[PDB]
């Protein structure tokens, strides 16, 4: 019981370290197999992200549509975490503003998309968006890397469901 969980968390920490080593690294489906072909429930596999809430609270309409709106939001949210791990961060990375057409159509189009930015470190609720606390001067690399991996893993899981090739497709379809 705890051995399958241990093997998952070790593989999760290994893949999150590679993100810190290279923020632009792309992971193959083979590298994610320990994370993809796991019998553990969602709460044991997603420690930062709330995968069940992000999926069920956005499951409205056809799965062809809302799983795709979720994937696009997860895609752009992955880039937010990758830029934080980059050796040359963007100039104004400390704050994110919400009055953008792409942001409205991606992050603000899914329930709980803003809360993923909080997991990166954007905890200060600002007028136009979110920002880091005044104390921190740099993001927590381990926290950003683990959240970016979970965002990457969930987008992968949803993409395999859209292709009907998920290794545990029947279990995940029953949300």
């Amino acid at each position: 019981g705890e051995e399958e969980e241990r093997a998952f968390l070790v593989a999760r920490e290994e893949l999150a370290s590679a993100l810190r080593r290279d923020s632009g690294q792309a992971f193959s489906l083979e590298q994610l197999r320990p994370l993809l072909a796991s019998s553990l429930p969602l709460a044991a596999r997603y420690l930062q992200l709330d995968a069940a809430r992000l999926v069920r609270c956005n499951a409205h309409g056809e799965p062809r549509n809302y799983l795709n709106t979720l994937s696009t939001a997860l895609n752009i949210l992955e880039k937010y975490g990758r830029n934080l791990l980059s050796p040359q961060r963007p100039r104004y990375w400390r704050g994110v503003k919400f009055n953008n057409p792409v942001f409205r159509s991606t992050v603000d189009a899914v329930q709980g998309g803003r809360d993923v930015l909080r997991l990166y470190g954007y905890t200060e609720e600002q007028p136009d968006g979110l920002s880091f606390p005044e104390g921190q001067e740099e993001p927590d690399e381990h926290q950003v890397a683990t959240v970016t991996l979970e965002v990457l893993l969930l987008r992968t899981e949803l993409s395999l469901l859209l292709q009907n090739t998920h290794p545990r497709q029947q279990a995940l379809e029953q949300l």
Partner: peptide, 14 residues
């Protein structure tokens, strides 16, 4: 959207 519209927009919200 395309992958480059997403990355450019990320830098726009900063």
């Amino acid at each position: 959207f395309t992958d480059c519209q997403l990355a450019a927009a990320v830098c726009m919200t900063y």
